[PDB]
């Protein structure tokens, strides 16, 4: 009659249910599971929320991880195919379906992707009023603008989600030639996040000492800091020999990360250049700005690229915008 | 003419500065400085206030922490004595100055305290408005009272201190004779706070086995079970050939664990009890209540307490009272 | 000619590189990947083991999470197939390829399964002389004795990995109809990890006041108490319209929890039913053991299961044996 | 007769109890007590130690802590005045008694301190054989060498204490007029722990691009950056307006952080400067060395210092051997 309630009872007070801190993801999979993975264990976000048109898998998904539910503490995990769900949410992420089939053309990957994206802004953002997106989905950078633009949510609110692993990778392997790591290894590479992906090695240094100075000059010849680049371009490539990213998960846990708890830090992201170097027509691509509580707390951090790099990042500007020309809204 | 600026600018967007998640505390020390080492080592608050008389002391503490600042992460820290500076907090406790010497008399505390306490009440509430308030302060179930009807904020926003660490203590000193620890070794023991609280041993297993069962009855005789809960009201008593308490700090940092996070666990404390057992009287006092999110989750846990502690617990409200009557107010 | 080397000098002393805490995995993959993101991003390992005969995926596994590497912080990473970089291990686990089909025959995986799983032995064991086994893969209890027996390393450092969720999954069901969560709400289910897993209701309690009590007794009619658990054997089932399990890995990383820092708490696994209920010929199946520092702790806890169940669980290890019977060792 | 022990078996097996991580304390106070509650509630040994002529307050201490022992997970804390106890210690650091009165001779303190320091020598060593020595000790440079020299344990393994916090209160008062935090605000200060500690500007930036390059020069005139350091070397003298330091605990828990994992970061601490800069004589000093299990990974990173810090550096090494010369030994 009254069984778990004889057992627990109330008070005459009575603050109805409600809650705080909310989480959203699209894409309940590899990307999305994996950010779940590590968001939801590293601990953050009230309740938590997961939406996709693929009920069956949700359903094992929201339901198995939910189980695990108890290893840790969140609250709860919503999941749904009508983005009624969320309304009202702070950190909230994208990704999609369109992934790299080993051989190139990420950027094909815009005609077939703004189909199924499109849709999906009118319905993020009519919930979501107060909630800052980050697109995990493919192009972090190019599909970033195609939703912000759509949606307009001001700048410091949307996030894309491009060049967070870049550096990582980059600084990361880096210290396997020093003996010391990623931490204090502090190396920065800086575009959009696909091949071609300017690298500002000029910024290479260690603890308070600067790089290239200890070497002197740099790539054109010596021992290929060349390559170290590339495969950093190339690292999406061969893994899939896996079938895709499992795992980059962090990056994008990482981000958000400044967010929802609001720091200030500097970190890459995609944000708008137009009155910068030579990009000058709302070119949405791979640059720091410093985000924090429901938005990028309004600052893109000023630094003097060496023009071999200088002009490296105008470049990408204007090879990325040839595909959004076209435009196919 | 913009050092900071040229290499930090800003966007067009401008959402101003702001905060979420605040934390205040009221006696930077002991109680106070362990508590923060606490919550703030631990990380939850976006912004922490501290607030005292003792501008001196403040400055030292407020600015050294500060120091470590850096060794985690939470936003910024403020000091003063005007409540002022809060404006706005949801995890608010206070402790003050009255600690025991030695020698009795934790009840004494009465008269000498309510002096300092009492004023110490317009300013906290009137802009904590949505704060909820946990009392470190002597008399945890006792003072708790004082302030409440006082201020009067509805129950479950409203914790004492009361008796937390009292099981912890007990549930502790227990897993040593068990080889096994506080951990899973659940063992409680309910009241007030002060020599005397009853202890619901009846409550007494581990895994999905009840303890009085595997070795049957009880304490009258006995390898002085009896023992184990008496210096767990003497554990007050000798430590401080110490001084005081310098880091129960854990526990109040728990006890708002749950508020803050808002995840309803069943923990002590200090609510009202008016129509339950004997106590007739609001007479707040330690006993389960199940809090979250800016409210202590409006559920007091009813359990069977065997008659030899059904009445202990009904006695302590009895012997508590005594001390408010006199009123003082 | 010295780069890193000028930035980076030694000193005269020089204690060679070497390392101290190791993690192992085998099966790079979903229980495996999720394990990993676990135990990787939770923090435990010196450096981690993982080794397949899946050379690809592993490149693609080890070196993309190792992206992330610098999310967090571990040390190293290994990958290889020849059980040789491992050589020295304290937590050790094991998976495999043989994973439920929506249709049954969990059982069935019996045959396919010790066909890989026994060489693996040899391997694992002859490396990891110090090390500790834990299997995610199928058949939590049945697989574990297969390598015990064979490997023969005494019990307590043995650890199948069976019915750990099972009791999560029950105990978190548990809080949705209470409005607490899987948190206090202790709820016991223990068995051997497949649909017919003997509950334990009788452990049915929150705070100190024991459940069945509150309500009185139970199922053979209620409200279905008796559906809660079969779902529970049922979990495995629906789930798989996802195709498996990519995330109960929070489960085995709690389970070796306590191992790898060996704090002696109280959790199901699989261990030696010899001289206990009916049980008597090595049933390795779901059970109470406590487990530490690179052994089970040494204590398997007793308790008193009502017949009704405390039949069923003698049971399991009778319908459980049926299948090691045939042997084909 | 066997109460713990009918709930509790053990199996045939039998590892013998032992532990692995070990962590000891010297000092039960603020620096010690601050120290234990940061590496105690963060998490690091098996089991922790503490050790002073102080038997009332380490009761008090060891016992109370331990109190909340229960509020996070260490396993066991231990205590006396013997050190036969910790036999066998990773991380060991010591403070002892001898803070500054507000005036200065922070110097001073070698007299008064070499004392009883000294005798804490022959014990401390002769059960930690395989142990790292940090001294929060005043003097963090200065007595450092004393043990030392006096032990003789491989460099790589004894870290003073010095100049950790010199640069966060650096870093940190930084990101104040940055708007950006101690975090990316990456500033350096090294020398040895006191007023006229030399600082390196020249190592002033933040994301990838150099700072002084972005103001362009400094120091003689400008705005004062010269303050910012001063009531560095200042902040230790207010503070005590509070009596002492009783949380910097983070820096020294920081220290040791890398060495108890063993990871190789870049940190301040002391070392030998003997073929270096002008110093030539075993100067114990403020300098960067990695450090790592057991070790300070031996590598002592060199920068170009400008020639005004570049002496300074040097300076320091001179002005600081006055005091040792007179032995006193
Ligand atoms: N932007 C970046 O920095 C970055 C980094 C990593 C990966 N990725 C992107 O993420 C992808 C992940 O690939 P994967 O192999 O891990 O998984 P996947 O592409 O096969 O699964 C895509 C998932 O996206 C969600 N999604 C797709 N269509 C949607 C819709 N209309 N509404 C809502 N949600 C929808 C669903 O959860 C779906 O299952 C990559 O291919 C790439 O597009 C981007
Ligand atoms: N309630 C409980 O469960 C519980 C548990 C532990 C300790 N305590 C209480 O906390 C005390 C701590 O003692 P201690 O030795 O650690 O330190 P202390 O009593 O010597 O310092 C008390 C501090 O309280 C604050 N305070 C006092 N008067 C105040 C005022 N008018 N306005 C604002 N703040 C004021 C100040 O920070 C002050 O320095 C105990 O004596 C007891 O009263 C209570
Ligand atoms: N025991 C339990 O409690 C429990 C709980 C969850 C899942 N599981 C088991 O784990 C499986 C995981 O299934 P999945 O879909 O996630 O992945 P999967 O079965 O398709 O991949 C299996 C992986 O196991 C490893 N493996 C297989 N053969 C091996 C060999 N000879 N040597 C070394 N490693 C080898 C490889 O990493 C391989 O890719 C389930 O099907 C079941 O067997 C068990
Ligand atoms: N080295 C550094 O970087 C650094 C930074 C912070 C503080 N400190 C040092 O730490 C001190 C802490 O001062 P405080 O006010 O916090 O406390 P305190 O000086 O009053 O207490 C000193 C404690 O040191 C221990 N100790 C003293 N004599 C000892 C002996 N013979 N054997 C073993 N242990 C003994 C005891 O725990 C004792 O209570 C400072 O004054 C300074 O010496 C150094």
Chains 1, 2, 3, 4 share one sequence.
Not at 93 to 119: D, H, M, P
Request: aromatic share 6%; with cysteine.
């Amino acid at each position: 009659t009254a069984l778990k309630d004889k057992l627990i009872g109330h008070l005459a007070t009575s603050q109805e249910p409600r809650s705080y801190n909310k989480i959203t993801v699209v894409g309940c999979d590899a990307v999305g599971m994996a950010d779940a993975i590590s968001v939801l264990m590293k601990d953050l976000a009230d309740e938590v929320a997961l939406v996709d048109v693929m009920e069956d898998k949700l359903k094992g998904e929201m339901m198995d991880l939910e189980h695990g539910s108890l290893f840790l503490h969140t609250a709860k995990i919503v999941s749904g195919k009508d983005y009624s769900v969320s309304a009202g949410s702070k950190l909230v992420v994208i990704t999609a379906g369109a992934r790299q089939q080993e051989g190139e053309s990420r950027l094909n990957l815009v005609q077939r992707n703004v189909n199924i994206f499109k849709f999906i802004i009118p319905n993020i953002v009519k919930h979501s009023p107060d909630c800052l997106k980050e697109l995990h989905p493919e192009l972090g950078t190019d599909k970033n603008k195609q939703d912000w633009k759509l949606s307009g949510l001001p700048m410091h609110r949307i996030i894309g989600s491009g060049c967070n692993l870049d550096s990582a990778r980059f600084r990361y392997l880096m210290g396997e030639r020093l003996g010391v790591h990623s931490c204090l290894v502090i190396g920065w590479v800086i575009g959009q996040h696909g091949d071609s992906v300017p690298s500002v090695w000029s910024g290479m240094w260690d603890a308070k000492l600067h790089k290239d100075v200890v070497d002197s000059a740099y790539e054109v010849i010596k021992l290929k800091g060349y390559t170290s680049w590339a495969i950093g371009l190339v690292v999406s490539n061969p893994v899939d020999v896996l079938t895709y990213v499992a795992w980059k998960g962090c990056s994008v846990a990482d981000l958000a990360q400044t967010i929802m708890k609001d720091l200030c830090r500097v970190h890459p992201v995609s944000t708008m250049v137009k009155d910068f170097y030579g990009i000058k027509d709302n070119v949405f691509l791979s640059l720091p700005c410093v985000l924090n509580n429901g938005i990028s707390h309004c600052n893109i951090v000023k630094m003097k690229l060496k023009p071999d790099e200088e002009q490296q990042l105008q470049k990408s500007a204007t090879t990325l915008w040839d595909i959004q020309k076209d435009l196919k809204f």
